[PDB]
């Protein structure tokens, strides 16, 4: 039963918020429809994609609600999803005497020589065959470095020797050390096999008779790899004699003896460099810091483990029967050396020391000993206290770079300057010392910050446990002085700690957004943990969040939050709002867009009915109950309110709703804008906003209605109440089929000249010659208007050619004109051209999605090369330009000045014609501001010729994705 | 001391900071079955390691799951409400 | 990578300082991001948007010439081909230009090369072929060690195009003396054979019932399996190098070995043509959602095209010859192959 749903959950988890919103919306009509089998509204509304998946099994079953899933997905024109759904129920749906003498010989010598210095079922199944079907000849262990694979080794040889493991297979086994293989310069198989016998002679063809009875243990192969490193060709002889690496080498990658089965122990290092040799491996996995944690404890800097292994160490290091005793000049000298050999340990990842490399580094064992007690954590915090206190270039740089257990050592680095775990070491060492590398540390989280671009969320994460681990105002302030705006994903309780901490010495930040998932207690009832009533309520997971809810609050700088992706249960808004709502917080936007915040809506309006300081305010995405809409009205009617905007996009809206919204369109003072985009709107619901507008009182001054659906009705509606009116400003109609007598409507109505609107647009309304026609009369004689557009309307060339002769007149006061996807061709170019020459009150211009060609930009060239023309931007892209038309351009830019914008994208340009092109934009004539080109699409000739231009001019910039530092408003308006 | 087969697919990079949760030891038979035949199927459908041990005591389950973070959580998750609804389940029969 | 001076991590430069002190002696590249919430790219002012910017995040030495490449983006392995074996990467960890591979699949046999490769689109098998081979080999990606789990034999053949069609689990290959032959994959026993045709056929193409093939003699044929009719040919002026399907719309891509691209109908006889180059075309992929196409060919460029009409949206060169390209499931990642090396970019709109 949980195995057919869960492959279904992972299914439903691929489609997005709207694409969720879509699929329940069709699974409430297909359970609408149907009759035998019924399903609750309100259940099929609440429920999140978990509880979607598990309630559609409750009741339809496996194979049905799988079935209808599928058939769903193909209806939202998902056609991939729906193989992939295909193939997880195809999957996740069920269907419906010498020898002994040996042995006992190595049983003694490896007793004896382990005495100088459960998991057995798991290895007798090692080498069985799966629920597959497959026999492996190599296995492989890696795990944590403190458990002995020595030991476990040894063991594994001891239950062979005894029998009790693995009594039927094989016959022999060698054990094999590296260190020792290292000793040797020259070695064999054969000198390995003498050497292991006690009389040192064996039956070579004996040994060789069969290859099912030989087994082979190699330990520790991480240890050494330098040797290993090296390429030299494989042997095929057993016999001959070769270095120890090669045959190693051979031994592994199955040319030598390939007919036997082996295995290997090592490390994670050594996996990571080990598995591109192994072939067909089965790897097994084997899980002291739990008792090293427990004895620094009792040894004893509760709040970071850097401070419990600061005291663990510097208690240790006070000299035995004395406290706080200056250490001696041969001690330091000593301890800077223990230092030294942990720091190259470190590099070379290397966790073992032979006798020969601590006599080169010259310390004595006595007091290595007595400075030492046990682990790589502590080689990381020595190494790190080294910093504290060979080859220019290697490959050891490279694998400590690597930064998987180098992470550790750079957090104790950052842990060590603060000065709480500071004065120990100052006392105990009786010194001032003096270091730069916290100033290295500044400078690397200053160039984090020191990026254009907003901070990526890993790296703002990791910095933030870093300045945490730090410890210090002033550092952490001047660290984080840099940057303005953040990114920061949070996932664990950690997380909020380390970032409730460090976001209150951010002086400068301006903007932040935040994803929370998974971080929510589970819910008091329906989903009680046996391990977790403290734990499930009134968790310390609860007080963390109200903390950075808080700070959140408190902080005087911050003006815009955000929530990315958020999964927000109702007490969690509960505590932010809470701690929104007091006076003293200055937060002035909020985007709820892409957040699931549905059954915390409620608690929202109070902030706006409270707060002083807030202005706008988003929503989307989330379904709105009646009583909702009635609550925000009431709270907007609230004299106390001050918000400029407000938002609702798809959250469908009942017809009462518009009602209510129109009465507070009429009451409310400081509304300026509003925005009702993706909601059904029919035309009973365009009224009451048209008898909302016809009064006097009304002060809107922007109006947007996407994919609302209104027709000619609601034209007429909104034209009548557009003569009433003389507030509004800017009004947008777009993807609404209103056709040519809508169009018509509208232009009857601004064709008086006391309408007072200033910026329209009408993209896909389903225009033609006709109602372009009805533009172009209604155009000429107004004064008001400034900003079209009229975007993905198939106005032909004849209807451009109506409009330009209309504007061609002084008297008309027309900026921006903007259109795309028009159909146009030559002729319409040329039009165009005389226009710009003529006209004065024309600023921008837009052709985009047009296949001008060569001759209508060529018309173009001959229209800007006139100095009358004042022209500021142009917009051509997917124009299908090439180097003759290239030629004529760069020639008239050579010639204009008035030009800033341009925009070059998508055009197929030969190296010649972009020779010219770039001679062209040298020149000290020309002076663009924003040129639209991609540096990367050319060769490197081009890309050095832009680059130079580019050095030249400094202020020129030159970025493939148009409208960068553009005028804020174009865009802002629409959305 | 454990030791588990993991498969060639997994990074090793992945298995640093694992997540636990416990739950009743016959709730867990149920959620996985006597055999814990199925727990390969996740894993692959999921792209994350398991392991269901039972406690000395025999009372409760512990739970460990490999993986990036939100993998983890999201698996939790819905073994949380999976486990809801069999003891829900439960209740009602 | 190559293109910038010299591509930086944000902790690399931290360890070069810490390892100058040691020894006494945008501007950062950027990691692959898999989370739909995390890419985060704003709205033009799943999704059939036409990309509009990339990026190279990594270089993968093979060490030989790369015949052939796949990605998978469910698992976040790629697959590198060459003519002695198969080489699998990881794009789980963070570093410039990898050298150690996650596994490697060597053939020996005397004599014994490959040409081809072909990941299944659940990313849970592996074809692979070549000249003097016994049989051609599947491997198994889903248990937890990789091994062959099937042989689909084939006695003196050189195979040269690989093929599979998972919902009616059957596996296509055509060979040098113009033979195709139809595996069942359950018992791995041949269905049927399609001959006739002594220049064989570079490139197979299956959807449905129908089999697309092209070659050097400059024609297109589709066949179908239900019957033994002859094949339908469409004549063309050059030499077809590659195939490909449009998954949602009935239209045939292909590369004519002149530097021009065609679209070709199922239903009826017309054509257009979407793109003209210089070079031959060695490769054209199409995306998954099918409202673009990825082309490679002989003049070292890496192009993308839009399906309306076949403009091209942006173009990346190269130093070398590029001989094949694969895109993820995802529709966010590209791989592309030259020289001994194989590139990945990814896709933002």
């Known amino acids: ?975 | 001391p454990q030791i588990r087969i993991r498969p060639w697919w997994f990074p090793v990079q992945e298995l640093r900071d694992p997540l636990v949760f416990y739950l009743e030891a016959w709730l867990a038979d149920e959620l996985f079955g006597p055999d814990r035949a199925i727990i390969p199927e996740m894993e692959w459908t999921s792209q994350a390691l398991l392991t269901v041990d039972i406690v000395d005591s025999g009372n409760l389950v512990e739970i460990t799951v490999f993986g990036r973070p939100r993998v983890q959580n999201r698996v939790k998750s819905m073994l949380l409400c999976l486990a809801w609804f069999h003891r829900e389940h439960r209740a009602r029969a | 990578l190559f293109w910038d001076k010299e591509p930086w991590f944000w902790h690399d430069t931290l360890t070069e300082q810490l390892w100058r002190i040691f020894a006494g002696v945008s501007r950062f590249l950027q990691s692959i991001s898999w989370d739909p919430e995390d890419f985060e790219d704003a709205w033009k002012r799943k999704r059939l948007a036409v990309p509009c910017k990339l990026e190279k995040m990594r270089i993968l030495a093979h060490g030989e010439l790369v015949l052939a490449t796949a990605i998978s983006s469910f698992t976040r392995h790629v697959f590198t081909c060459g003519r002695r074996g198969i080489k699998v990467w990881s794009l789980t960890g963070q570093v410039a230009e990898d050298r150690f591979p996650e596994s490697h699949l060597p053939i020996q046999t005397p004599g014994a090369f490959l040409r081809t490769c072909l990941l299944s689109s659940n990313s849970r098998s592996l074809l692979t072929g070549g000249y003097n081979l016994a049989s051609v080999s599947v491997w198994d990606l889903a248990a937890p060690s990789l091994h062959v789990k099937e042989q689909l034999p084939c006695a003196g053949l050189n195979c040269q195009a690989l093929d599979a069609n998972l919902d009616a689990n059957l596996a296509f290959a055509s060979f040098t003396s113009g033979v195709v032959r139809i595996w069942d994959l359950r018992d791995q026993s041949v269905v049927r054979d399609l001959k006739g045709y002594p220049d064989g056929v570079k490139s197979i193409v299956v959807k449905g019932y129908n089999i697309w093939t092209g070659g050097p003699d400059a024609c297109l044929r589709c066949w179908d399996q239900r019957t033994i009719m002859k094949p339908l040919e469409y004549q063309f002026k050059s030499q077809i190098m590659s195939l490909s399907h449009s998954p949602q719309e009935d239209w045939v891509l292909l590369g004519m070995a002149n530097g021009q691209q065609w679209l070709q109908s199922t239903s009826g006889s017309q054509r257009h043509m979407v793109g003209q180059k210089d070079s031959v075309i060695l490769s054209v992929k199409f995306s998954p959602f099918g409202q673009w196409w990825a082309s490679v060919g002989m003049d070292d460029f890496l192009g993308v095209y839009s399906m309306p009409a076949g403009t091209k949206v942006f173009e990346v060169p190269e130093m070398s010859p590029v001989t094949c390209c694969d895109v993820s499931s995802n529709n966010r990642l590209v791989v592309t192959g030259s020289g001994e090396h194989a590139s990945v970019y990814q896709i933002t709109y």
Not at chain 1, 479 to 505: G, M, R, T, Y
Not at chain 1, 866 to 875: D, M, Y
Request: net charge neutral; aromatic share 8%.
């Open chain 1, 1 to 975: 039963l949980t195995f057919s749903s869960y492959g279904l959950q992972w299914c439903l988890y691929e489609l997005d918020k709207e694409e969720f919103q879509t699929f329940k919306e069709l699974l409430k009509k297909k359970s609408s429809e149907s009759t035998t089998c019924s399903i609750p509204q309100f259940e099929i509304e609440n429920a999140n994609v978990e509880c979607l998946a598990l309630l559609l099994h409750e009741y339809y079953g496996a194979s049905l609600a799988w079935a209808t899933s599928i058939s769903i997905f193909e209806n939202m024109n998902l056609r991939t999803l729906s193989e992939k759904a295909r193939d997880d129920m195809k999957r996740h749906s069920p269907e419906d005497g010498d020898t002994w003498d040996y042995k006992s010989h190595v049983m003694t010598k490896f007793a004896e020589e382990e005495d100088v210095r459960p998991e057995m079922q798991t290895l007798a199944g090692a080498f069985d065959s799966d629920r597959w079907g497959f026999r492996p000849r190599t296995v492989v262990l890696h795990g944590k470095s403190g458990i002995g694979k020595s030991a476990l080794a040894r063991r594994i040889v001891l239950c062979w020797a005894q029998g009790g493991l693995y009594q039927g297979m094989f016959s022999y086994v060698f054990f094999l050390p590296v260190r020792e293989m290292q000793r040797k310069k020259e070695s064999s198989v054969t000198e390995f096999i003498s050497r292991e016998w006690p009389d040192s002679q064996a039956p070579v063809t004996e040994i060789m008779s069969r290859p099912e009875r030989l087994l082979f243990i190699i330990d520790g192969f991480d240890d050494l790899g330098s040797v290993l490193n090296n390429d030299t060709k494989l042997c095929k002889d057993w016999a001959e004699k070769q270095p120890p690496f090669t045959l190693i080498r051979s031994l592994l990658r199955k040319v030598l003896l390939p007919e036997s089965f082996l295995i290997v122990t090592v490390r994670d290092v050594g996996t990571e460099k080990l598995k591109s040799e192994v072939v067909s491996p089965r790897y097994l996995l084997v899980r002291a810091v739990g008792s090293l944690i427990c004895v620094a404890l009792q040894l004893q800097f509760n709040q970071t483990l850097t401070g419990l292994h600061a005291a663990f160490v510097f208690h240790q290091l006070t000299p035995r029967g004395v406290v706080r005793r200056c250490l001696n000049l041969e001690e330091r000298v000593v301890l800077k050396r223990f230092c030294r050999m942990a720091v190259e340990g470190v590099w070379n990842r290397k966790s073992v020391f032979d006798g020969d490399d601590l006599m080169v580094q010259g310390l004595g064992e006595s007091e290595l000993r007595a400075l030492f007690h046990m682990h790589l954590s502590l080689q990381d915090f020595c190494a790190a206290l080294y910093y504290v206190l060979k080859t220019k270039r290697s490959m050891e740089l490279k694998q400590a770079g690597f930064h998987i257990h180098s992470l550790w050592m750079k957090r104790f680095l950052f842990g060590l300057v603060s000065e709480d775990v500071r004065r120990p070491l100052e006392v105990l060492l009786g010194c001032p010392v003096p270091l730069g590398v916290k100033q290295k540390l500044l400078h690397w989280v200053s160039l984090l910050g020191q990026q254009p671009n907003a901070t990526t969320p890993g790296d703002t994460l990791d910095a933030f446990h870093c300045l945490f681990e730090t410890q210090d105002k002033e550092f952490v302030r001047l660290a984080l002085n840099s940057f303005q705006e953040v990114w920061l994903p949070i996932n664990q309780n950690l997380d909020l700690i380390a970032s409730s901490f460090c976001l209150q010495h951010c002086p400068y930040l301006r903007k932040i957004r935040v994803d929370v998932k998974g971080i929510f207690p589970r819910d008091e009832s329906a989903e009680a943990c046996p391990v977790v009533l403290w734990m499930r309520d009134k968790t310390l997971i609860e007080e963390q969040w109200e903390d950075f809810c808080s700070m959140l609050g408190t902080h005087p700088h911050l003006r815009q939050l955000d929530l990315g992706s958020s999964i927000l249960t109702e007490r969690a808004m509960k505590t932010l709002c809470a701690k929104l709502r007091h006076p003293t917080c200055k937060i002035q936007t909020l985007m709820f867009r892409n957040a699931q915040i549905t059954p915390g809506v409620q608690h929202l309006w109070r902030i706006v009915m409270a707060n002083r300081n807030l202005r706008s305010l988003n929503l989307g995405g989330t379904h709105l109950k009646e009583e909702d809409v009635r609550m925000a009205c009431e709270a907007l009617k609230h004299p106390k309110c001050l918000l400029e905007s407000l938002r609702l996009d798809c959250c469908g809206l009942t017809h009462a709703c518009y009602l209510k919204i129109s009465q507070i369109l009429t009451t409310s003072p400081s509304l300026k804008s509003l925005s009702l985009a993706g909601n059904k709107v029919t035309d009973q619901g365009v009224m009451p906003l048209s008898d909302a507008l016809r009064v006097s009182q009304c002060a809107l001054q922007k109006l947007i209605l996407e994919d609302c659906g209104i027709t000619a009705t609601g034209c007429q509606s909104l034209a009548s109440a557009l003569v009433s009116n003389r507030s509004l400003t800017h009004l947008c109609l777009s993807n609404n089929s209103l056709g040519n007598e809508g169009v018509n409507l509208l232009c009857r109505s601004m064709r008086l000249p006391h309408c007072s609107l200033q910026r329209l647009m009408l993209n896909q309304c389903h225009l033609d010659t006709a109602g372009c026609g009805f533009l172009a009369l209604a155009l000429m004689g107004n004064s008001w208007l400034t900003h079209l557009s009229l975007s993905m309307n198939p106005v032909e060339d004849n209807g451009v050619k109506l409009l330009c002769e209309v504007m061609r007149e002084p008297s008309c006061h027309l900026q921006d004109l903007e259109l795309v996807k028009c159909h146009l061709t030559a002729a319409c170019c040329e039009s165009l051209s005389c226009v710009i020459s003529r006209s004065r009150h024309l600023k921008s211009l837009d052709l985009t999605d047009n296949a001008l060609g060569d001759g209508g930009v060529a018309a173009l060239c001959e229209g800007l090369k006139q100095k009358n023309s004042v022209l500021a931007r142009l917009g051509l892209k997917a124009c299908g330009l090439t180097s003759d038309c290239c030629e004529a351009l760069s020639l008239a830019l050579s010639c204009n000045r008035h030009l800033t914008s341009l925009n070059l994208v998508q055009n197929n340009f030969s190296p010649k014609g972009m020779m010219k092109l770039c001679s062209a934009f040298a020149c000290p004539t020309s002076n663009l501001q924003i040129i639209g080109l991609w540096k990367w699409q050319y060769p490197v000739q081009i890309r050095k010729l832009l680059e130079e231009v580019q050095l030249l001019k400094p202020r020129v910039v030159i970025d493939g994705s148009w409208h960068s530092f553009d005028e804020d408003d174009r865009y802002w308006w629409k959305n």
